[PDB]
Amino acid sequence: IIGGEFTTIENQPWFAAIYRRHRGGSVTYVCGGSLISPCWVISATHCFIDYPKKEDYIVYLGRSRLNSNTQGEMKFEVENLILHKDYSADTLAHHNDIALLKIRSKEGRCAQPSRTIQTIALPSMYNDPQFGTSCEITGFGKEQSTDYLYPEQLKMTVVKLISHRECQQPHYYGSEVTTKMLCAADPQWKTDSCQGDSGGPLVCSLQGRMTLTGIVSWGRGCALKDKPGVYTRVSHFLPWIRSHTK
Ligand SMILES: N=C(N)Nc1ccc(C(=O)O)cc1
Numbered sequence: 001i002i003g004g005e006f007t008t009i010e011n012q013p014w015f016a017a018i019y020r021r022h023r024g025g026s027v028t029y030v031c032g033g034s035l036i037s038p039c040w041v042i043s044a045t046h047c048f049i050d051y052p053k054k055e056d057y058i059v060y061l062g063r064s065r066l067n068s069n070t071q072g073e074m075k076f077e078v079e080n081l082i083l084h085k086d087y088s089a090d091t092l093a094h095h096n097d098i099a100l101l102k103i104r105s106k107e108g109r110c111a112q113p114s115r116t117i118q119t120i121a122l123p124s125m126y127n128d129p130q131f132g133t134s135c136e137i138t139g140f141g142k143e144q145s146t147d148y149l150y151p152e153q154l155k156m157t158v159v160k161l162i163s164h165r166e167c168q169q170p171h172y173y174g175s176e177v178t179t180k181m182l183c184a185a186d187p188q189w190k191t192d193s194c195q196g197d198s199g200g201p202l203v204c205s206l207q208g209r210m211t212l213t214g215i216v217s218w219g220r221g222c223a224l225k226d227k228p229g230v231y232t233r234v235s236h237f238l239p240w241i242r243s244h245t246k
Pocket residue numbers: 192193194195196197198199216217218219220221222223224227228229230
């Protein structure tokens with residue numbers, strides 16, 4: 001997250017921290033995700049597509065720090081890693097950039113909700129906020145495009161939903177943006193998602209409910225003029241979500 005503010009997991013208690021085991025045993029952060037039910041985290045296929053072996057990955061819930069334990073955190077193995085069969089990546093764009101991780105602990109339990117661990121609601125079908133709505137993004141991604149390190153402390157910011165018409169303008173992203181994606185940016189381009197925020201939630205208020213509207217997917221640089229963040233439009237994937245979590 002470029003700009004915005006530091007936060008703790010109690011403010012975004014559906015945030016999932018996804019890590020990968022290396023041969024040798026070093027463990028590095030991969031991507032964010034969102035807990036949509038006690039046994040299911042939703043994320044981005046592009047996070048896993050190079051290393052699609054579920055045994056390689058660890059999921060934490062109730063975690064506020066990247067490389068240290070948060071009191072109350074729960075650690076899960078991935079029982080299933082479901083990537084979207086129609087995934088494709090262009091030089092920029094990721095199409096159908098959505099993934100489902102079925103989580104289960106060493107004792108074969110799912111998440112127990114708490115102050116630091118809660119599910120986020122899915123939107124109703126094709127039901128997105130109006131363009132110019134303010135939504136929240138959460139992640140451990142870079143604080144600056146030129147940073148080598150990720151922040152140790154979770155961050156969140158606010159960006160405004162951009163209309164498809166605006167986002168498909170040539171000097172923005174042209175046809176690289178589709179109706180299955182949402183664009184969001186700061187009017188001053190001063191805050192954005194960045195590398196390492198992939199898979200993380202875009203949350204908006206819909207009929208008085210915090211709702212998972214989007215999943216961090218792609219973008220040209222971060223917090224660049226005319227280069228919005230691009231998000232998987234979750235309200236266009238409910239059949240795929242429903243089918244693979246039955
Ligand atoms: N918000 C942007 N302008 N860019 C941007 C978005 C996502 C990612 C990612 O790694 O998923 C990287 C860069």
